């Protein structure tokens, strides 16, 4: 499929208890590769993916400094948002941003984004043209005027179109042995008496990467979409993902039902029965 590099910043104030907490996490596709956590006596940008050993030795020091400077401006944004929204100094509040770029499998850029949130709600976002801002309310409109006057969209667009894709391309190369080899799911079906006349068929898919997957129940080859229960995809803990799909069937009718598993790592869809 396509590829993306995604970063997420979170800033949380704590009145009475000192300085705000600041977390960065970065992802290539469904793999976390760095983190920064200000909760430490000397916080560092740190690797979270083994193929990050291949960076230049000055990388960690450089990224640690940029991270500390970013924390400082998010500390100031938490106080600024208090003034825009006319809130007291008493309560804890949250400021978040997320941004990233996307790339076709051949490495070509096609999408970049940048958004900001305050207390869990849209605050301001870069528009699809990467040349203008959308403010979510009148408080955020202060930030819209300020950032238009100072030409911030261009600097944001420059980063998302050049540096972001350039480095997404390098990281994919660094971790090709793992980021570009899909791990197919291991699928099985289980049987558990639901009612006196009915049974639950559960179709399990474990140990797959990346996270995108199709798990559907068919009865006599037709889609059973209304009557399936389907859990949100969840992490295995080892960098793999899991999902399952269930359906309730009349007893003895099991053979009517089939489970289809489409995943990037499967040459052809798996088809399973009880």
């Amino acid at each position: 499929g396509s590829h993306s590099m995604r970063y997420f910043y979170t800033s949380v104030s704590r009145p009475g208890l000192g300085e705000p907490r600041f977390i960065i996490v970065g992802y290539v596709d469904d793999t976390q590769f760095v983190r920064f956590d200000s909760d430490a006596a000397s916080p560092r940008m740190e690797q979270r993916a083994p193929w990050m050993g291949q960076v230049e030795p000055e990388y960690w020091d450089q990224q640690t400094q940029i991270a500390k400077d970013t924390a400082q401006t998010f500390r100031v944004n938490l106080n600024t948002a208090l003034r825009y929204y006319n809130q007291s100094a008493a309560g804890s509040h949250t400021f978040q941003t997320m941004f990233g770029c996307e790339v076709w499998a051949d490495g070509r850029f096609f999408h970049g984004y940048r958004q900001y949130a305050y207390d869990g709600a849209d605050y301001i976002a870069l528009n699809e043209d990467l040349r203008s801002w959308t403010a979510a309310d009148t408080a955020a409109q202060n930030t819209q005027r300020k950032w238009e006057a100072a030409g911030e969209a261009e600097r944001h667009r420059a980063y998302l179109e050049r540096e972001c894709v350039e480095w997404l391309r390098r990281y994919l190369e660094m971790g090709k042995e793992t980021l570009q080899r899909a791990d197919p799911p291991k699928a099985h079906v289980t049987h558990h008496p639901a009612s006196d006349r009915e049974a639950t068929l559960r179709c399990w898919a474990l140990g797959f990467y990346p996270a995108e997957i199709s798990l559907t129940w068919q009865r006599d080859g037709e889609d059973q979409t209304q009557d399936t229960e389907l859990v949100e995809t969840r992490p295995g803990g080892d960098g793999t993902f899991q999902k399952w799909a269930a359906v309730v069937v009349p007893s003895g009718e099991e053979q009517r039902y089939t489970c289809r598993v489409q995943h990037e790592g499967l040459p052809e869809p798996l088809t399973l029965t009880w």
Partner: peptide
């Protein structure tokens, strides 16, 4: 890789 954009709101 991150850069510093000084994102003061």
């Amino acid at each position: 890789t991150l850069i510093d954009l000084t994102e003061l709101i």
